[PDB]
Ligand binder design. Structure first.
Ligand SMILES: Nc1nc2c(ncn2[C@@H]2O[C@H](COP(=O)(O)OP(=O)(O)OP(=O)(O)O)[C@@H](O)[C@H]2O)c(=O)[nH]1
Ligand SMILES: [Mg+2]
Lengths: 570, 18, 415, 180, 198, 142, 10
């Protein structure tokens, strides 16, 4: 096996060397530790055939960290191959030199990189642009010592716009790891030159020629208007990432534009169609598009205000797209499309995804909380869903009703009668507590509130801490409001929560309630059954400081997670 | 023939607009 | 900024891997499969994973998951675009995307992976251009890659000059169970297969509403394309300036432009379906299909999928026209019609059995989806006006194009 | 296609048919089924499950599926409703307090949209005590004439002797087959 | 009526979970169609295929009444298939095992020593809190017999009933008295297990 | 008494299952998956005993497919291994050189052998040849 | 394969 392969690779016939190289490449692909023969394949490296040299370079790159010591027998080959008239061989050598993660090899590779930096061949220049960045990633100080930043800067000032895009990408990569000392920023002339090649760059080169402007900051409206006049055409590109980059650049440049001029309105009207077209992309890009829309929706909500039908989830949509569709609809929920949102949410409650059902219930609750003009419709929909007898649906609706009653309980007394007999056998801790709180707070329209609390007092000592506290609060409220039919219930609750109750917070609450009852029951009406102030809703809008920096990070991992770029990298 | 509609020849430009 | 573009399998075996930066250990792929299994079994599965400080963003292919590891805050959209370009290149080079080619085409796959992206930045993705420097059966790279025109190789010569166009319509309809249509969008797609000599500069001209308004002809039938997405060959500056569509078509079949506009017109097909589902006894399918399209057009291969019960058995079909087949693999009533003249009306009355014992879990209501494909019918009314084929040498081109109308997201919500 | 084999089989008889046997417990259903199959009064404990047998008479395979009348087995009659063509009702005229319950059970079982082709077959069992009513008083009490689209026929069968079983079988055969 | 081996071989040809589901449903539709016709000849093969599909992780609630019908049949292969189906897809919470009490009682007095063994094994493996209440009378009858192949099954059935019904152990005291002199090792082991449980 | 027995393959596919406890199907499906994950995530020197939810889950795989059981915390543990070995020997003797192919295809015979050998979680026959004779007599009946 | 192998090899 190994001995036979070594004998074949140490032969003089190329018909056996090519087969041995193919077998070595397949064994590593098959998951074989072939690093033991690294010095044996090194002899058969300088060959005239191009189909065999690529395999040797790939094996050396994949077998470079494992045997850095045996890697010292390849610098001469790279140096000899970095001068071949064929551009393909030189480009392959340049690409393989930077791929070798060897600290004792990158030092001697500076001369070939310097020679290839000003190469007339555009493929060689493009390869060297990436090689310079690869070398700087390994040794940052070596690149500075070799003086490659000056050469990299002039690459933007040259023809071959693909090479210009590669050099721009390399400069951006170098500056990203840089501490911002000696920034590679340029005046408006450099931006104009880059724009003059932006219409000539390839599909991948456009993203590179667009990310550079993401760091520059304009100072006037004329420069920003001129830049937008060229960034607008990028909205009609077939690459879904080019459209995203153009949208991010337009949003960043809109921080300096003036809304009083007619340019802001044109920019707003010409970008809605781009986001709408992005919504019809591949299912994998759907999550990214939804995250970008959510991150842009909190900044300028006047753009996609009329785009609600395209936010409807499809039957074949993925789960990660279905979850984001509800959030997008909630963020765009308004009184104009309240009925459409209610209709879409009602059909989402007949699905089978339990997580999807919980998300739909949460979105319905959020829509009801955000808009008070459709609160009655939301309450009716919740009552109808509860009447369908769904365990998960009933559990979600209990929390939804508990949340709705806390915000707008002024005219919610006509729903307590239906909720009085609602299959209270549900054991969900998040729903039983909500039902207990609703009964205690709304123990005026229910004439049998004392009788319903008896079924929940059988196992209050082993139900839960939150459930026990909610039951204790509800019993105290009922006793304070109606002390005729709940005189013994209060004493039983005090005895069960303070004598046989070992909960520290629960014991403290029971003792406080007993002390208040034994001190002055009249004052308990103004102490416990008091009018709580308006409840501050949990604002889903991000902080303006993180959103401003989040706008600059568009289409990256920092935008999907809605987290800072420094709180997620390691 | 061909499923989906027979291919038709297209013009060169808007002759009516110069 | 991907770290290592790998190719996985359906059992967790890495068919092929190609690291571009080396910042991520090659053994991190072993945790991708257990992480995916944990995410899928808890409803938190996503195409972009996270193994500690390493994210695994990938899409699912026919048989493999193209996972690409990363560590920094790389552009996930860029990674997805690179994955899509790689999938397209693999489809163009290999007719099938399965495990039979990954273990057999390693000689050219490694070269394609090395040439496509360097250090995490793809540089060349044109399959037609890439087919000139990396072959499985090497000279200097063509000047097209270095030249600005990276989608049309110079020196192409053909005996004839034939350009076949394909105006394929996409009828997407979102009809709610109440009977109203919610999402009714039409996505145009001009897919041409250019076969010309030289490097022609096509000048496409249609009956656009904006073009008609600018010329002053905003009174005839003009397509109101809300979104127009041209290919890389289409010059954005020319289209933005005065709606001038000038671009050099590539050699072969490609997507030039993809129109996308809403439609406020009545549906071409009206599907009136009823469900007389007796409780554990039987069910009826009073499905009526009304063709609202023009009587001059015929929708070839009409296939209205009707989701029947998953546990339905002993089915009977009392229809009017077209074969009705029950497919137990898909669990739906496939209302298959070969030719449906416009204005026609086919009535069907289904009747299937049901077990006495009730099911253990709910099954959901999949939407009824029609598969109509009506050729030679443009619903949006967009008509191609001119195609300026200009060549330096000078030749008389013979442009051709056909209009195909099919169904897109033509689903109908059930009751 | 050719169906000459079907005609050849029909030359000697091809139809077999099926039948059901439901009713309240202690209604003489098991003894009647045993007499129909064997011809003797066999002693059987109350039917916790059911009894399924076949009868070969008049060239028709009379498959009988006995069903008990247990309270926990009352709602289990829907299991035999699938692929069922016949139905026989066995009343218990000796239990006045259970007559209302039997009538209610028959009405609930007659209120199904799946059993429409099954004709009514009322069998008067326990025709040995003087307290048993005639073939019209029971029908009038149950209102068998108020069964729209239901071909009902009351027949008095003596469990101890076996008189009237042949007439009921002939009537069932005439109701099933509509030929000479 | 495809055989179980052919179905297993076809299922082995399934690679993806979604395609395997379609292949399983392809046979499930035919099985449902055959069961809706009240097929009696090839019922054993359909029952085996349904049991394999249910073990494969597919729903088979529709194949419940067909097991009850096959349990009260007369053939031996059909009876074995019905017993296996009752043991596998039948449980106390099914709500469909109530009708099997009559079939078990009918098969409890059968002359065949294997059908009665299958019925006793099914009752032991899937005994409910109510079937034992109506089956305790016949269990004690088989425990006082001299059948060595039946004494071990009777002891196991009594132990299962006592575990399910702790208040019925009083009816087993006069049956296990003077039963420690069995020459066979299985009978002695069953008696020792029953005594330890008591 | 053995709560359940599950013949699962090394790839995770289950070739046999026999539970003596009346549990829900979703609960049974979750329990089987959890057992497969725990057994599949264990080394070759874990003692072949796991206390999963107060149940001594003992695993002793003699081939690529493994075996598992669930005995209550009131009996010996080596007895489960001895019973598993006896069942494996009986299965090998009844069929003849029992392999993986014969188990998926002949699961009906394995179920019948298990029923004639272990009933209710308890054992039915201590010997190894009487059970074989009884199984042969039952199968030859037709 | 690994499946055609005997269980105990006796
Ligand atoms: N004296 C007398 N008793 C009869 C006669 N016919 C039926 N019975 C009584 O009716 C009871 C019913 O017996 P079966 O027919 O075996 O059982 P069943 O009618 O199916 O009732 P269940 O098994 O509980 O469903 C018997 O126990 C008899 O006592 C009869 O002709 N004369
Ligand atoms: Mg009876």
């Amino acid at each position: 096996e190994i001995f036979e392969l070594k004998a074949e690779l140490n032969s003089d016939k190329k018909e056996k060397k090519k087969e041995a190289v193919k077998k070595v490449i397949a064994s590593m692909t098959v998951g074989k530790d072939v690093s033991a023969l690294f010095p044996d394949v090194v002899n058969c490296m300088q060959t005239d055939n191009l189909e065999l040299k690529k395999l040797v370079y790939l094996y050396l790159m994949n077998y470079a960290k494992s045997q850095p010591d045996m890697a010292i027998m390849a610098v001469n080959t790279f140096v000899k191959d970095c001068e071949d008239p064929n551009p393909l061989i030189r480009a392959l050598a340049v690409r393989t030199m930077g791929c070798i993660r060897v600290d004792k090899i990158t030092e001697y590779l500076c001369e070939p990189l310097r020679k290839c930096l000003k190469d007339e061949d555009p493929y060689v220049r493009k390869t060297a642009a990436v090689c310079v960045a690869k070398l700087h990633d390994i040794n940052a100080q070596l690149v500075e010592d070799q003086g490659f930043l000056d050469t990299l800067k002039d690459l933007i000032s040259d023809s071959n716009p693909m090479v210009v895009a590669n050099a721009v990408a390399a400069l951006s990569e170098i500056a990203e790891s840089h501490p911002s000392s000696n920034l590679l920023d340029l005046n408006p002339q450099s931006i104009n030159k880059l724009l003059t090649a932006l219409n000539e760059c390839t599909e991948w080169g456009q993203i590179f020629i667009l990310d550079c402007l993401a760091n520059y900051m304009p100072k006037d409206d004329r420069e920003a208007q001129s830049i937008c006049e060229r960034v607008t055409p990028r909205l009609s590109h077939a690459n879904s990432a080019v459209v995203l980059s153009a949208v991010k650049v337009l949003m960043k440049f809109m921080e300096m534009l003036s809304k009083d001029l007619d340019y802001y309105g044109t920019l707003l009207k010409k970008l809605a169609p781009p986001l709408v077209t992005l919504l019809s992309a591949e299912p994998e890009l759907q999550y990214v598009a939804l995250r970008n829309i959510n991150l842009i929706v909190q900044k300028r909500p006047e753009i996609l205000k009329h785009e609600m039908k395209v936010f409807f989830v499809k039957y074949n949509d993925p789960i990660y797209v279905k979850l984001e569709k509800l959030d997008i609809m909630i963020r765009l929920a308004s009184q104009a499309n309240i009925a459409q949102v209610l209709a879409e949410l009602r059909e989402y409650a007949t699905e089978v995804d339990v997580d999807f059902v919980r998300k739909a219930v949460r979105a319905i609750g959020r829509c009801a909380i955000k808009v008070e003009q459709s609160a009655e419709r939301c309450v009716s929909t919740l009552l109808d869903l509860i009447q369908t007898k769904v365990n998960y649906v009933v559990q979600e609706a209990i929390v939804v009703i508990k949340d709705i009653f806390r915000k707008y309980p002024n005219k919610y007394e006509s729903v307590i009668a239906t909720l009085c007999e609602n299959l209270d056998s549900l054991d969900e801790p998040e729903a039983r507590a909500a039902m207990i709180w609703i009964v205690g707070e709304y123990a005026e329209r229910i004439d049998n509130a004392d009788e319903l609390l008896e079924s929940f007092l059988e196992g209050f000592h082993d139900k839960s801490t939150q459930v026990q506290l909610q039951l204790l609060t509800a019993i105290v409220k009922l006793f304070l409001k109606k002390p005729t039919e709940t005189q013994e219930l209060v004493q039983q609750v005090l005895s069960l929560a303070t004598q046989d109750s070992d909960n520290p917070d629960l014991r403290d609450r029971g003792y406080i309630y007993w002390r208040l009852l034994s001190t002055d029951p009249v004052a308990a009406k103004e102490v416990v059954l008091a009018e709580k102030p308006l409840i501050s809703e949990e604002t889903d809008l991000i902080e303006p400081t993180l959103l401003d920096e989040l706008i600059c990070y568009i289409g990256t991992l920092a935008s999907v997670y809605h987290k800072p770029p420094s709180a997620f990298v390691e | 023939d061909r499923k989906g509609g027979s291919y038709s020849q297209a013009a060169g430009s808007d002759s009516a607009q110069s | 900024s991907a770290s290592a573009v790998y190719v996985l399998d359906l059992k967790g075996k890495v068919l092929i891997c190609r690291n571009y930066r080396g910042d991520v250990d090659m053994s991190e792929v072993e945790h991708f499969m257990p992480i995916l299994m944990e995410k899928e079994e808890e409803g938190m599965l996503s195409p972009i994973l996270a193994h500690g400080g390493v994210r695994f963003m990938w899409i699912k292919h026919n048989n493999l998951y193209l996972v690409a590891t990363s560590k920094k805050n790389a552009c996930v959209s860029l990674v997805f675009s690179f994955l899509y370009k790689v999938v397209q290149v693999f489809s163009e080079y290999f007719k099938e995307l399965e495990e039979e080619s990954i273990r057999d085409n390693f000689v050219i796959i490694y070269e394609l992976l090395d040439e496509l992206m360097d250090f995490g930045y793809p540089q060349t993705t044109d399959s037609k251009i890439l087919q000139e420097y990396i072959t499985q059966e090497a000279p200097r790279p063509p000047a097209t890659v270095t030249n600005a025109v990276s989608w049309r190789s110079e020196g192409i010569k053909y005996r004839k000059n034939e350009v076949f166009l394909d105006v394929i319509e996409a009828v997407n309809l979102l009809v709610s169970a109440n009977g109203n249509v919610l999402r009714s969008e039409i996505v145009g797609s001009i897919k041409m297969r250019v076969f010309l000599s030289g490097m022609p500069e096509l000048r496409l001209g249609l009956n656009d509403k904006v073009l008609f308004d600018n010329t002053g002809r905003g009174k005839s039938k003009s397509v109101e394309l809300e979104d127009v997405k041209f290919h890389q060959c289409v010059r954005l500056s020319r289209f933005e300036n005065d709606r001038t569509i000038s671009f050099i078509p590539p050699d072969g079949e490609f997507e030039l432009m993809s129109y996308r506009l809403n439609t406020h017109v009545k549906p071409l097909i009206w599907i009136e379906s009823v469900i007389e589902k007796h409780s554990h006894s039987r069910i009826e399918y009073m499905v009526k299909a009304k063709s609202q399209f023009k009587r001059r057009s015929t929708a070839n291969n009409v296939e209205i999928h009707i989701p029947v019960p998953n546990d339905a058995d002993s089915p009977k079909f009392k229809t009017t026209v077209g074969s009705v087949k029950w497919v137990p693999e898909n669990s739906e009533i496939v209302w298959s019609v070969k030719s449906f003249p416009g204005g026609k009306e086919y009535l069907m009355r289904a009747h299937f059995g049901l077990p006495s014992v009730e099911a253990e879990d709910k099954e959901g209501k999949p939407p009824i989806s029609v598969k109509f494909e009506i050729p030679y019918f443009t619903t949006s009314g967009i008509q191609v006006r001119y195609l300026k084929i200009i060549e330096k040498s000078g030749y008389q081109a013979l442009p051709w194009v056909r209009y195909i109308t099919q169904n897109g997201d033509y689903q109908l919500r059930t009751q | 296609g050719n169906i000459f084999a079907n005609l050849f089989k029909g030359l000697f008889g091809k139809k077999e048919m099926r039948i059901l046997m439901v009713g309240l417990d202690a209604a003489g259903k098991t003894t009647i089924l045993y007499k129909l199959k064997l011809g003797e009064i066999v002693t059987t404990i109350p039917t916790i499950g059911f009894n399924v047998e076949t009868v070969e008479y008049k060239n028709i395979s009379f498959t009988v599926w006995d069903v008990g009348g247990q309270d926990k087995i009352r709602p289990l009659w829907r299991h035999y409703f699938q692929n069922t063509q016949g139905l026989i009702f066995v009343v218990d005229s000796n239990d006045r307090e259970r007559v209302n319950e039997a009538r209610e059970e028959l009405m609930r079982m007659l209120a199904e949209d799946e059993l429409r082709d099954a004709v009514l077959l009322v069998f008067a069992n326990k025709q040995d005590l003087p307290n048993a009513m005639n073939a019209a008083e029971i029908t009038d009490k149950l209102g068998l004439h108020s069964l729209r689209h239901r071909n009902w026929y009351i027949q008095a069968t003596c469990a101890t002797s076996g008189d009237g079983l042949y007439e009921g079988l002939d009537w069932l055969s005439n109701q099933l087959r509509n030929q000479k | 009526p495809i055989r179980l081996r052919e179905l297993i071989r076809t299922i082995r040809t399934a690679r993806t979970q979604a395609e395997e589901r379609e292949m399983i449903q392809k046979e499930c539709a035919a099985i449902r169609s055959s069961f809706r016709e009240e097929d009696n000849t090839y019922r054993c093969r359909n029952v085996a295929k349904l049991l394999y599909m249910h073990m494969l992780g597919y729903p088979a609630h529709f194949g419940q009444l067909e097991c009850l019908k096959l349990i009260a049949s007369q053939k031996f292969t059909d009876k074995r298939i019905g017993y296996l189906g009752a043991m596998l897809l039948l449980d106390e919470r099914q709500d469909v095992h109530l009708l099997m009490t009559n079939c078990i009682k009918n098969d409890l007095n059968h002359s065949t020593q294997f059908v009665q063994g299958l019925a006793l094994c099914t009752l032991g493996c899937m005994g409910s809190s109510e079937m034992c209440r109506d089956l305790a009378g016949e269990v004690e009858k088989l425990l006082k017999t001299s059948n060595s192949y039946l004494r071990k099954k009777a002891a196991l059935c009594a132990v299962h009933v006592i575990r399910k019904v702790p208040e019925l152990m009083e009816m087993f005291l006069p049956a296990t008295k003077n039963l420690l002199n069995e020459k066979n090792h299985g009978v002695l082991h069953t008696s020792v297990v029953l005594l330890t449980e008591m | 008494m053995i709560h359940f027995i599950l013949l699962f393959s090394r790839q995770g596919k289950l070739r046999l299952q026999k539970w003596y406890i009346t549990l829900p199907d979703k609960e049974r499906k979750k329990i089987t998956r959890e057992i497969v994950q725990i057994i599949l995530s264990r080394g070759h020197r874990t003692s072949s005993f796991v206390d999963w939810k107060e149940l001594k889950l003992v695993y002793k795989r003699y081939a690529s497919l493994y075996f598992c059981c669930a005995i209550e915390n009131q009996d010996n543990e080596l007895l489960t291994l001895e019973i598993v070995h006896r069942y494996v020997e009986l299965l090998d003797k009844y069929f003849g050189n029992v392999c993986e192919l014969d188990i998926i295809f002949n699961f009906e015979k394995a179920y019948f052998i298990l029923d004639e050998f272990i009933i209710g979680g308890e054992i039915q026959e201590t010997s190894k040849k009487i059970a074989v004779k009884a199984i042969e007599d039952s199968d030859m009946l037709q | 394969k690994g499946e055609n192998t005997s269980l105990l090899h006796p």
